[PDB]
């Protein structure tokens, strides 16, 4: 798995409150977090399929 | 059904206001609740279809 | 049309601002209202197709 | 074009913040606006394809 | 690539909190920004496919 997958989730400085997915290396699966709408880091997925596939396994 | 289906819905500490479905085991069916965006428990579904099937 | 279709739309006590459809008997058609995210009443449709077929 | 296509967009009294399309006469095309959730007038579409076909 | 791809994203004056995409020329791809719901400039895409197609 990519090492960005080990990064904690980042809401960012913007004000939206949008559901995104992030991989939790600890839990071993992707989980939800609130994304603010700008400045996403890479452990941030619009689709849970993507997060699982990119970071899971 | 899994045991998690018997647990009351859990909004969590985040501040978004998203509709999710939870299984109401008293009523025998899935209903909506407001989820906050993080730290979901398992009786929480984005799709009512999945809720009814999983906890059905 | 089911009798619940005659009921006025029910936002409910939760805090979300979700758009839903409610059949408006007076008007002869389904219209939008803001739903709270919990404790819906039956004149409450996520899909307007569903609202008209069920209530129209 | 339907005459309602000429009407300015109507946010309405409810307090959701929904993106909708309306047709702009001046501009000659559909643009986005913020719909509040209730009391829509007709120059108001969920679909931009619907807006453009109906009013353009 | 179209000149408008070089313009900075424009939230506009309305009060919605909606995610849209803008081409970031300096960065080489499209990113997200919060769109207020009205008065879009052209470097604003509802679809990221469309953004990278139009502007990449």
From Swiss-Prot, chain A:
What Gene Ontology molecular function terms does this protein carry?
Answer: calcium ion binding; molecular function inhibitor activity; potassium channel inhibitor activity; protease binding; serine-type endopeptidase inhibitor activity; sulfate binding; zymogen binding
- UniProt KW Secreted keyword: yes
Q: Which UniProt keywords apply?
A: Disulfide bond, Pharmaceutical, Protease inhibitor, Secreted, Serine protease inhibitor, Signal
One of the GO BP terms on file:
negative regulation of platelet aggregation
Domain BPTI/Kunitz inhibitor residue range list:
5-55
Q: Which cysteines are joined by disulfide bonds?
A: 5-55, 14-38, 30-51
Subcellular compartments: Secreted
Statement: the UniProt record of this protein carries the keyword DNA-binding: no
**Site positions per UniProt: Reactive bond for trypsin:** 15-16
What's one GO-annotated cellular component? serine protease inhibitor complex
Q: What does this protein do?
A: Inhibits trypsin, kallikrein, chymotrypsin, and plasmin.
Q: What's the protein here called?
A: Pancreatic trypsin inhibitor
Q: Which organism is it from?
A: Bos taurus (Bovine)
């Amino acid at each position: 798995r990519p090492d960005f997958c080990l990064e904690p989730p980042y809401t960012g400085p913007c004000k939206a409150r949008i559901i995104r997915y992030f991989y939790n290396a600890k839990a071993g699966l992707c989980q939800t977090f609130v994304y603010g709408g700008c400045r996403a880091k890479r452990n941030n997925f619009k689709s849970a399929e993507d997060c699982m596939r990119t970071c899971g396994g």
